Amino acid sequence: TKPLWTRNPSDITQEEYNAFYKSISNDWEDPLYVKHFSVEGQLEFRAILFIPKRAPFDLFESKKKKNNIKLYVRRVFITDEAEDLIPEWLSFVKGVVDSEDLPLNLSREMLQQNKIMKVIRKNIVKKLIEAFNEIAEDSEQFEKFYSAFSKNIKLGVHEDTQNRAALAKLLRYNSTKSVDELTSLTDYVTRMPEHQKNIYYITGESLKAVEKSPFLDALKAKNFEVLFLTDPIDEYAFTQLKEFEGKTLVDITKDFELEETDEEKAEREKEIKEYEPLTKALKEILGDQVEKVVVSYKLLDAPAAIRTGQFGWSANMERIMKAQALRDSSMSSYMSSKKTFEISPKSPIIKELKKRVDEGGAQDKTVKDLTKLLYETALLTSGFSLDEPTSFASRINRLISLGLN
Amino acid sequence: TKPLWTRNPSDITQEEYNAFYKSISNDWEDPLYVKHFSVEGQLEFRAILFIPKRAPFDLFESKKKKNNIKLYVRRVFITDEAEDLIPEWLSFVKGVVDSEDLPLNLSREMLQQNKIMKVIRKNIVKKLIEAFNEIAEDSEQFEKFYSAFSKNIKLGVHEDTQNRAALAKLLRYNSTKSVDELTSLTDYVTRMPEHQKNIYYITGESLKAVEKSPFLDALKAKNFEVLFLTDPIDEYAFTQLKEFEGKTLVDITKDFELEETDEEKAEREKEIKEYEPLTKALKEILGDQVEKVVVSYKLLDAPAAIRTGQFGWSANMERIMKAQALRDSSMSSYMSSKKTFEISPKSPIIKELKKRVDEGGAQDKTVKDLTKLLYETALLTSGFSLDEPTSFASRINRLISLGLN
Amino acid sequence: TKPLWTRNPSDITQEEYNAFYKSISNDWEDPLYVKHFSVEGQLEFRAILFIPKRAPFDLFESKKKKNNIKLYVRRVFITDEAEDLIPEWLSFVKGVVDSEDLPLNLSREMLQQNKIMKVIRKNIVKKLIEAFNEIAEDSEQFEKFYSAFSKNIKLGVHEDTQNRAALAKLLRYNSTKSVDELTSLTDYVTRMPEHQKNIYYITGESLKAVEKSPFLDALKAKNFEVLFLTDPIDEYAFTQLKEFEGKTLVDITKDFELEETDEEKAEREKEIKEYEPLTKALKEILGDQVEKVVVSYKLLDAPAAIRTGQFGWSANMERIMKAQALRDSSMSSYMSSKKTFEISPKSPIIKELKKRVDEGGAQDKTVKDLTKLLYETALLTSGFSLDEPTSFASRINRLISLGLN
Amino acid sequence: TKPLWTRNPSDITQEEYNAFYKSISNDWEDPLYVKHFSVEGQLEFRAILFIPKRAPFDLFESKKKKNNIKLYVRRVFITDEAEDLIPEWLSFVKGVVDSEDLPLNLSREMLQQNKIMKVIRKNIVKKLIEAFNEIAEDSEQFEKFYSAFSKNIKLGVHEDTQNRAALAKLLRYNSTKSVDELTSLTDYVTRMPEHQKNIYYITGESLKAVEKSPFLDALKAKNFEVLFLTDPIDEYAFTQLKEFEGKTLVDITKDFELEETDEEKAEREKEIKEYEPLTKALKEILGDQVEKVVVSYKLLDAPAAIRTGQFGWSANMERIMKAQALRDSSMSSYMSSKKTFEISPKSPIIKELKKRVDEGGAQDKTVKDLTKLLYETALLTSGFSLDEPTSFASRINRLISLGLN
Amino acid sequence: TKPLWTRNPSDITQEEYNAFYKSISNDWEDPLYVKHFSVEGQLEFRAILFIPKRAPFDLFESKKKKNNIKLYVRRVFITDEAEDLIPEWLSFVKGVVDSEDLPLNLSREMLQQNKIMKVIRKNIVKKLIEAFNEIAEDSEQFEKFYSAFSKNIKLGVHEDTQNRAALAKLLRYNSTKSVDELTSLTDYVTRMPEHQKNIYYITGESLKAVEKSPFLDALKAKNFEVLFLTDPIDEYAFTQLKEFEGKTLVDITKDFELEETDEEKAEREKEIKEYEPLTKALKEILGDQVEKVVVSYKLLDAPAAIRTGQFGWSANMERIMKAQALRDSSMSSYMSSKKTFEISPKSPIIKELKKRVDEGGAQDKTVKDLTKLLYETALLTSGFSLDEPTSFASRINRLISLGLN
């Protein structure tokens, strides 16, 4: 009679694992995948870890319990409340780990024991990634795995600094080039033309919301795929990954793409300069509400828009840090990010404002009102809340009337 | 020798209570007030309850522990985890209760015990309100009690159906007529002119936000005080109290006030009827985004506005239930309320829309666009988030050009 | 490949529910009944609740754990320690509830969430009663359901004010007219002749004890069914139900029935008045031990008896509140109850005492001793403990002593 | 600048101990007594234990927490949930123990450590009794110590087999010869005449009840002091102590005293034998309700009485085991105890029954009824509940009924 | 319907138990043995206890939870955290006990309840040993039971004073005559020759270590079996059992065996006396590091050795209590034992030291050094750590040179 985890995997039937899983898990369903391995070498252990079909609870929300993998040493049960055997992003994992080297009844002063635990843990994580990569091979199997554990995967990417890279490969999203189905980063990279330099994503409330972005039009025309990231960790993960091959970037932020077809690269400076005295003029109005006014070719068929600085929390994030101050009835402190007001010369509305400026109209109540209004609108369009009812109400009424009487 | 609480209050010094409080409380500070009483009659007990100067923790936020008043029976310590000895809205209270009648070691089947427990509690609560009424006598003393316990007071008003009425008297708020200082309901009531019928209030994010309400202008003109309630319970409480003498009402909801000068009462129907075919027309455009379009005289110098139905959670509340789904991606949906789109005939913008309708222009892209836009604006003005960037952006740009082009 | 509770009941097999139950329950046995339903409308949720064959534990006695139904929102596990999702009397219920509307991470200040909880609960209860009503259809199924959950049923009647009425229907008792088998209230109501006005029960220790009640004889003669209630909740439930069509009443309390075919109604006052000077006389002896001495026709072939006042806790309840003080070396009395000493003119023993009174023997040591003794006896007979050994011992030896020499 | 307990007691002031106590205790009051000692030798430790003025909680009742003495080793805090450092009956004790010898981080397999614990404990107990013995010196101090810790004292006697003997000394009771004031065992032993062989106690509900015992009269006449024990542990303790010099015995049980100045010793057998055919006769009636009928001279001026067998739980205990079954709608009997029905030949009532028996009246319905009734009465008198209402009611009415007509 | 444990064992199938076990245990495997019995008589209960195939956790190590046997009274679940229903040495046992006599809702003052609890437990234990005795019948079955529970068996022998004797019979060990296989005490006993008087054992680190003991040679030569006990409890158990037929004894302690050939018995005193002045001399050098120097015939072909006193913890135990202080820096000190320094006259090295002493060389630096060194070596040989590097190093280097220089 010998404990299941000491036996050889090729020599345990399913059913055995199934019952073992059941007895440890309170899951009525069989386990999605069973990873049963042994390490040898410097340190030695055996383990049977199980991947459930469905999340037994979820990280964030869903209360928060410690992992309950059965830690054994030298085949003797020690605890199922192991201190640092596995990271929070894998708390859903179930099973047994039987160490040969963990010391028993040693003062907590002896840190050799933590180090040993720390390399047992590191191994588990390796082996589990190896398992996910194996599940990935089966489309149906992975469908459920991802559907249940995406957020763990994402947190893994945020948290783990070694395995960050490999875990990325298990991420999956909708995109412009994958509307129904979910696409991989590796796939996204395949669809990249020879001259695309970066991987483009967009962050926002939901899929529905994120496609209406005015920011898309430009990349689309260029034929670049844009990924959709509608969950908050999505950002924390991405901003921490930094890159996959090319750098990964939100296009709701300070972008900078290509020779704008090298021809356009040429005539742009010619134009950008013509607009300079507008640039300065608009900034004189907006004052501090903005960091700077600029001309954008990354903006199609829309007068203006707002891009938060790169290296600073996205519009989508502000939206959340800020909806809070408007609930917490004490706070009004802001850690936020800098705003860049973009102007599209292609939009006749802009062409027109240039005209009035190139005609001494640098401080017309009319040109002031238009600017201001265009700005507030940008905030809306670019998914921001604006600045106060009054001001904005007023601005609009004064311009309906011109379109009426 | 004899336990402090058995002794006669007039015959225990301060310093004794003070050390008693300190030993039971982990408060470094002395207690704000000590209510030490004894009930006799049907049932008997003595108690000493303390009121802290500062909340030892807060309900909502601030974790959530069980009350720890030391329950004694016949001078024998039983527990400081009493089952229903005091309501959650008073969890902050501290001290000892010593019952003479509570039975020991009775099956939980014997409900007599709960009933006894229930009449001990009802009494505590009585005595405590008695205590707060006493503190109310001292301006400085109350200042701190209120400052710490206002929310308990409000939850009390929401929860307690008997003492609801009395607890109200302890509430305090800023108002139109009390800008810096807090005013009492009873006070507000004094401030009523003979013909005021109701007590006006307003729900909103903060004071700053709530004064910019366009809904104030009307009451101001009539001279009626409006109360400011910037906290969620403020509402759950008021909607539960229902009235203090007159009925209490948010003016962000379907109001109905005062004769309007009975003269105006007269010419109004004449006008309202004139507008009927506009009313229907605008509703035909808005479809289901609104419940109904109406003409308001409760709206001054502003084209349009939005009022949620009375008997439904305020705009201010939606703002909050809605901002949540926009943090939760297992969501998409909110407790909206019924929206009433209000039209001011005094605003020329409206006079004009009637003109175009009284001229077959019932389905002009121009009249459609203006309506739609006036509506979206109302949401902003009336403290709502709108419906989607796109639509809104578009509408404005066209207003700009076509009102300038 | 989708959580069991989101699937359609008609399309889940048994065996699936069975294993689901087993994984959630630690019951080695299958479930008694599985109610799997969905609510739509105002709010939305699906659930699968299970009814065990046998109480997993009992309320009262058997420790006391919080319910462990798995609360989900939007298909995401939140907790199995739900705040107020199900009432105590149903704590034995097991399974899953998946709300669509419950908000996550909202301040506890937001009471909307409790309200939503409150309606989710109310529904569960509805559906649950629904299920019992369905189990009620099967005799053998119900037998076990009742045998296990009767006390829950009873507490529910006591507790729930809405469903009280329907829950009654599920109660079941022995009665005078149902000696072996259990009868329903609805049944009892059938067996009621046209002129029976109330529903009659009796409260006492056990069945064996409760049949020997002298109080039955009068109802029997009248051919009125009496129910037997030998459990304490039985009472708390009854006294809370108040009625079923007619008022429900203990006949160990202040009754008042009929008119004795009305003939007896006539001659009674004639007789009652004859006994008046006895009445007053016996009361002069008993003093305060009694509230009043009266003549009863509700008492057959027994000299005297004792009825607690109606609107006051039954003899059976006192027996319990009082057996406690006699374990607490600290309690002196409690509530007790007002006692009414009943005299039967048909018993020769009484006829005789009248004789001695109608002969100046108002204060005979002999007449005193007989009264006192008759009284103590009534306490025994009417299921009470008496007053002190001494006094009673003495009385008997003498009424043996004079009874011979 | 060194931990208080390592310092020399003669060199710590009060005020220091007081604050130390207060920091460790949450008692607003100072300690009653502080025992601060050190052991050296085989093993070594220092301690400061405190005795409260008033029970911080009570054993039995009052929940039940583990002791929270601060266990230190080598001046390093280890825990305040010590494994077996102090016995339950002392759980109220507060302070610090600092062992020099307890091993840290040793497998639980190493029982040496428990042994060391075991002797540390045994010592504490020694020193503690030492302290009580010291409090015993001060009347007022002891008054409060006893008033608070009597039950601990009693449990200790029950529990501790070594210190049982000394702990007795600290007990205190009312007695026949000490009516107001409390007397010690050692005192009682003084008041014992040369020929008194045993120490006599009685067990019952309260003082008031226990004095009306018919069992006292015999000891009184003999001029033997009887102690009053009105608490249940009193018994468990006594029956466990067994003796103090002479054997300690309940006189509600099978006694056997003296020789009645020996004269009575002579004429008794002559009489006992005369009654033999009555003896057998009454037993033929009572059947199994009794173990045996006997003639007692330990019973004055009362016809009959009931003594439970010695070596069996007292009447007082039954009263309790039995009041339980009568709350548990499930219990049938328990242990009970063998009953001995005692007859007093000095009571004319008995003399008479002999007469009817010595006249063929061995099976008279009249003689049956008297026996039975005398018996039931004995149960009441001797502090028992009887057998069924009916039977008893009936018996009385007739023995009223024939007692007149 | 009826709870499994109420049913008759001969009438419940396997599979029922098996599923019952599984539902209560979280063991994936079936139970090793199921003991299902019922007690009647004085007290009554039924039980089903299970024996696992493998330890569900281990005592010592392996955290430490309370036993979770489901306690029922009168077929009503009370708790699975029973107060003293089973001893710690059996905490691994699982199942249900259903008492008929345990009282519910009794003050904790009523110790009757503990007593009942105590006789339920005593019975369980009986039955369980009965079960182990049964398993003992099956070689393969026992193999696994022993393998899992040996330590419980041993703690049992240590703790349980009644069943001590029987539990012994279940112990198993390797020995000199059983090298691979485990042997029983009863077996060992068979292996005794007529004249063997005791049962020999040896305590040490492991088997490997314990066979290299120089203490074996003597017994081997005589042909006596020595048992190997490589676990700490092995000792705490044996020292508590004291004997099985003959007394049991570690031969690492003060032995005393067999006639030695009664011839040798004769010439020994003659010799021992010759050595007396050496004996004293060597002790004069060693001072307090030893208790006494003696001459041994229980020592073959080795100059000297060390035996701890009998009635004191073995060398093997010191090794352990000492290795701890050498991990603990709040220490310095250990439970040493008394050491006896043994001299073999057959070793020429000794013969020589006598020569130098019988020649005034009682205090030669040379004879001092040799003694000292022989001693330190004995500590090593006899499985002890020595006294300090320095001293020892030095001694050797001087031996090298001066034995070579």
mmCIF file of N, CA, C and O in Angstrom, chain D residues 294-341:
data_model
loop_
_atom_site.group_PDB
_atom_site.id
_atom_site.type_symbol
_atom_site.label_atom_id
_atom_site.label_comp_id
_atom_site.label_asym_id
_atom_site.label_seq_id
_atom_site.Cartn_x
_atom_site.Cartn_y
_atom_site.Cartn_z
ATOM 1 N N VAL D 294 -38.512 -0.095 55.284
ATOM 2 C CA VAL D 294 -37.860 -0.280 56.563
ATOM 3 C C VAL D 294 -38.382 0.649 57.637
ATOM 4 O O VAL D 294 -39.024 1.660 57.350
ATOM 5 N N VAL D 295 -38.076 0.275 58.879
ATOM 6 C CA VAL D 295 -38.419 1.006 60.090
ATOM 7 C C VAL D 295 -37.265 1.893 60.502
ATOM 8 O O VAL D 295 -36.142 1.421 60.654
ATOM 9 N N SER D 296 -37.528 3.176 60.693
ATOM 10 C CA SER D 296 -36.438 4.065 61.046
ATOM 11 C C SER D 296 -36.631 4.748 62.372
ATOM 12 O O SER D 296 -37.736 5.162 62.740
ATOM 13 N N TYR D 297 -35.536 4.880 63.088
ATOM 14 C CA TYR D 297 -35.564 5.698 64.261
ATOM 15 C C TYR D 297 -34.879 7.011 63.966
ATOM 16 O O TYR D 297 -34.831 7.907 64.818
ATOM 17 N N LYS D 298 -34.391 7.128 62.733
ATOM 18 C CA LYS D 298 -33.774 8.351 62.256
ATOM 19 C C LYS D 298 -34.819 9.297 61.688
ATOM 20 O O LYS D 298 -34.493 10.286 61.023
ATOM 21 N N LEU D 299 -36.076 8.999 61.984
ATOM 22 C CA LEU D 299 -37.186 9.764 61.467
ATOM 23 C C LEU D 299 -38.084 10.098 62.622
ATOM 24 O O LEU D 299 -38.627 9.200 63.247
ATOM 25 N N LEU D 300 -38.217 11.381 62.935
ATOM 26 C CA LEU D 300 -39.073 11.788 64.052
ATOM 27 C C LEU D 300 -40.322 12.461 63.522
ATOM 28 O O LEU D 300 -40.289 13.099 62.470
ATOM 29 N N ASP D 301 -41.424 12.307 64.249
ATOM 30 C CA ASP D 301 -42.707 12.990 63.959
ATOM 31 C C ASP D 301 -43.094 13.159 62.460
ATOM 32 O O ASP D 301 -43.588 14.210 62.018
ATOM 33 N N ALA D 302 -42.856 12.104 61.693
ATOM 34 C CA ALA D 302 -43.300 12.047 60.317
ATOM 35 C C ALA D 302 -43.549 10.590 59.999
ATOM 36 O O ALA D 302 -42.723 9.748 60.299
ATOM 37 N N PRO D 303 -44.713 10.282 59.425
ATOM 38 C CA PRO D 303 -45.055 8.888 59.224
ATOM 39 C C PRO D 303 -43.965 8.103 58.501
ATOM 40 O O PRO D 303 -43.450 7.119 59.043
ATOM 41 N N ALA D 304 -43.612 8.561 57.301
ATOM 42 C CA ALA D 304 -42.716 7.848 56.409
ATOM 43 C C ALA D 304 -41.770 8.833 55.748
ATOM 44 O O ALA D 304 -41.963 10.053 55.826
ATOM 45 N N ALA D 305 -40.741 8.305 55.098
ATOM 46 C CA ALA D 305 -39.827 9.121 54.305
ATOM 47 C C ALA D 305 -39.058 8.225 53.342
ATOM 48 O O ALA D 305 -39.178 6.992 53.413
ATOM 49 N N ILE D 306 -38.295 8.845 52.436
ATOM 50 C CA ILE D 306 -37.537 8.120 51.427
ATOM 51 C C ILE D 306 -36.056 8.492 51.408
ATOM 52 O O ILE D 306 -35.689 9.667 51.271
ATOM 53 N N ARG D 307 -35.208 7.475 51.544
ATOM 54 C CA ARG D 307 -33.759 7.647 51.502
ATOM 55 C C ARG D 307 -33.231 6.900 50.337
ATOM 56 O O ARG D 307 -33.461 5.694 50.215
ATOM 57 N N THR D 308 -32.497 7.605 49.490
ATOM 58 C CA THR D 308 -31.843 6.969 48.369
ATOM 59 C C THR D 308 -30.772 6.122 48.968
ATOM 60 O O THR D 308 -30.374 6.365 50.093
ATOM 61 N N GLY D 309 -30.335 5.106 48.234
ATOM 62 C CA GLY D 309 -29.237 4.262 48.681
ATOM 63 C C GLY D 309 -27.980 5.098 48.777
ATOM 64 O O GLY D 309 -27.760 5.994 47.956
ATOM 65 N N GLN D 310 -27.177 4.838 49.807
ATOM 66 C CA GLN D 310 -25.794 5.326 49.842
ATOM 67 C C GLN D 310 -25.055 4.666 48.695
ATOM 68 O O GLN D 310 -25.498 3.629 48.186
ATOM 69 N N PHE D 311 -23.932 5.249 48.293
ATOM 70 C CA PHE D 311 -23.215 4.812 47.080
ATOM 71 C C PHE D 311 -24.087 4.995 45.818
ATOM 72 O O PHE D 311 -24.138 4.129 44.941
ATOM 73 N N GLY D 312 -24.771 6.132 45.739
ATOM 74 C CA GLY D 312 -25.671 6.425 44.631
ATOM 75 C C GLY D 312 -26.093 7.875 44.721
ATOM 76 O O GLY D 312 -26.278 8.409 45.832
ATOM 77 N N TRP D 313 -26.254 8.498 43.550
ATOM 78 C CA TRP D 313 -26.518 9.941 43.435
ATOM 79 C C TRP D 313 -27.759 10.416 44.160
ATOM 80 O O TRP D 313 -28.856 9.866 43.975
ATOM 81 N N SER D 314 -27.572 11.458 44.964
ATOM 82 C CA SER D 314 -28.555 11.891 45.939
ATOM 83 C C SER D 314 -29.869 12.303 45.316
ATOM 84 O O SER D 314 -29.958 12.597 44.133
ATOM 85 N N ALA D 315 -30.892 12.335 46.153
ATOM 86 C CA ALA D 315 -32.195 12.815 45.766
ATOM 87 C C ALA D 315 -32.038 14.097 44.991
ATOM 88 O O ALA D 315 -32.629 14.261 43.933
ATOM 89 N N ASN D 316 -31.210 14.985 45.533
ATOM 90 C CA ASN D 316 -30.937 16.301 44.962
ATOM 91 C C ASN D 316 -30.409 16.213 43.546
ATOM 92 O O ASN D 316 -30.710 17.072 42.711
ATOM 93 N N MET D 317 -29.635 15.166 43.277
ATOM 94 C CA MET D 317 -29.031 14.955 41.955
ATOM 95 C C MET D 317 -30.073 14.478 40.953
ATOM 96 O O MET D 317 -30.122 14.978 39.831
ATOM 97 N N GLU D 318 -30.884 13.498 41.378
ATOM 98 C CA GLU D 318 -32.012 12.967 40.596
ATOM 99 C C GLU D 318 -32.922 14.095 40.119
ATOM 100 O O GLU D 318 -33.172 14.226 38.921
ATOM 101 N N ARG D 319 -33.399 14.896 41.075
ATOM 102 C CA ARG D 319 -34.165 16.126 40.840
ATOM 103 C C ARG D 319 -33.676 16.908 39.622
ATOM 104 O O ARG D 319 -34.460 17.525 38.902
ATOM 105 N N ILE D 320 -32.373 16.840 39.392
ATOM 106 C CA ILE D 320 -31.723 17.550 38.307
ATOM 107 C C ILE D 320 -31.620 16.706 37.029
ATOM 108 O O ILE D 320 -32.016 17.170 35.968
ATOM 109 N N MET D 321 -31.099 15.478 37.140
ATOM 110 C CA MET D 321 -31.054 14.537 36.004
ATOM 111 C C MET D 321 -32.480 14.337 35.465
ATOM 112 O O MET D 321 -32.673 14.046 34.286
ATOM 113 N N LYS D 322 -33.468 14.506 36.340
ATOM 114 C CA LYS D 322 -34.850 14.190 35.992
ATOM 115 C C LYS D 322 -35.607 15.383 35.455
ATOM 116 O O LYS D 322 -36.487 15.219 34.605
ATOM 117 N N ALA D 323 -35.285 16.575 35.952
ATOM 118 C CA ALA D 323 -35.914 17.779 35.429
ATOM 119 C C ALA D 323 -35.511 17.983 33.965
ATOM 120 O O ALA D 323 -36.215 18.659 33.220
ATOM 121 N N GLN D 324 -34.391 17.366 33.566
ATOM 122 C CA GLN D 324 -33.856 17.414 32.190
ATOM 123 C C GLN D 324 -34.663 16.601 31.186
ATOM 124 O O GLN D 324 -35.006 17.096 30.123
ATOM 125 N N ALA D 325 -34.942 15.343 31.513
ATOM 126 C CA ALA D 325 -35.728 14.476 30.647
ATOM 127 C C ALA D 325 -37.064 15.147 30.357
ATOM 128 O O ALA D 325 -37.653 14.965 29.283
ATOM 129 N N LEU D 326 -37.506 15.946 31.332
ATOM 130 C CA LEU D 326 -38.749 16.709 31.258
ATOM 131 C C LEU D 326 -38.557 18.074 30.589
ATOM 132 O O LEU D 326 -39.292 19.022 30.873
ATOM 133 N N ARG D 327 -37.556 18.153 29.712
ATOM 134 C CA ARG D 327 -37.294 19.306 28.839
ATOM 135 C C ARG D 327 -36.842 18.726 27.511
ATOM 136 O O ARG D 327 -37.079 19.292 26.446
ATOM 137 N N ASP D 328 -36.179 17.577 27.608
ATOM 138 C CA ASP D 328 -35.874 16.730 26.469
ATOM 139 C C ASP D 328 -37.102 15.875 26.163
ATOM 140 O O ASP D 328 -37.404 14.926 26.905
ATOM 141 N N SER D 329 -37.824 16.216 25.096
ATOM 142 C CA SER D 329 -38.909 15.354 24.631
ATOM 143 C C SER D 329 -38.269 14.186 23.874
ATOM 144 O O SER D 329 -38.391 14.085 22.649
ATOM 145 N N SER D 330 -37.565 13.333 24.635
ATOM 146 C CA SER D 330 -36.822 12.166 24.121
ATOM 147 C C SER D 330 -36.288 11.198 25.202
ATOM 148 O O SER D 330 -36.034 10.025 24.910
ATOM 149 N N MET D 331 -36.115 11.677 26.436
ATOM 150 C CA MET D 331 -35.535 10.861 27.499
ATOM 151 C C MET D 331 -36.595 10.105 28.276
ATOM 152 O O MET D 331 -37.669 10.643 28.533
ATOM 153 N N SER D 332 -36.275 8.871 28.673
ATOM 154 C CA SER D 332 -37.238 7.956 29.332
ATOM 155 C C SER D 332 -36.983 7.731 30.844
ATOM 156 O O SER D 332 -37.921 7.788 31.670
ATOM 157 N N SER D 333 -35.725 7.436 31.184
ATOM 158 C CA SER D 333 -35.215 7.478 32.571
ATOM 159 C C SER D 333 -33.773 8.035 32.547
ATOM 160 O O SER D 333 -33.514 8.995 31.799
ATOM 161 N N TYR D 334 -32.852 7.467 33.347
ATOM 162 C CA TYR D 334 -31.439 7.936 33.411
ATOM 163 C C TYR D 334 -30.473 6.996 34.164
ATOM 164 O O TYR D 334 -29.895 6.075 33.578
ATOM 165 N N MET D 335 -30.269 7.296 35.447
ATOM 166 C CA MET D 335 -29.671 6.387 36.427
ATOM 167 C C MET D 335 -30.711 6.207 37.537
ATOM 168 O O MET D 335 -30.965 5.078 37.979
ATOM 169 N N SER D 336 -31.319 7.332 37.943
ATOM 170 C CA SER D 336 -32.255 7.442 39.092
ATOM 171 C C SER D 336 -31.552 7.185 40.449
ATOM 172 O O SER D 336 -30.794 8.041 40.947
ATOM 173 N N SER D 337 -31.799 6.009 41.022
ATOM 174 C CA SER D 337 -31.273 5.609 42.321
ATOM 175 C C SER D 337 -32.279 4.715 43.013
ATOM 176 O O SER D 337 -33.502 4.849 42.819
ATOM 177 N N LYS D 338 -31.753 3.823 43.843
ATOM 178 C CA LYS D 338 -32.592 2.912 44.592
ATOM 179 C C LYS D 338 -33.229 3.625 45.784
ATOM 180 O O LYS D 338 -32.586 4.373 46.506
ATOM 181 N N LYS D 339 -34.517 3.414 45.953
ATOM 182 C CA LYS D 339 -35.258 4.130 46.965
ATOM 183 C C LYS D 339 -35.596 3.237 48.180
ATOM 184 O O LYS D 339 -35.961 2.065 48.038
ATOM 185 N N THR D 340 -35.461 3.790 49.376
ATOM 186 C CA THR D 340 -35.772 3.053 50.572
ATOM 187 C C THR D 340 -36.839 3.811 51.312
ATOM 188 O O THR D 340 -36.626 4.947 51.704
ATOM 189 N N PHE D 341 -37.989 3.159 51.479
ATOM 190 C CA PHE D 341 -39.178 3.723 52.097
ATOM 191 C C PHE D 341 -39.172 3.511 53.592
ATOM 192 O O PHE D 341 -39.301 2.377 54.060
#
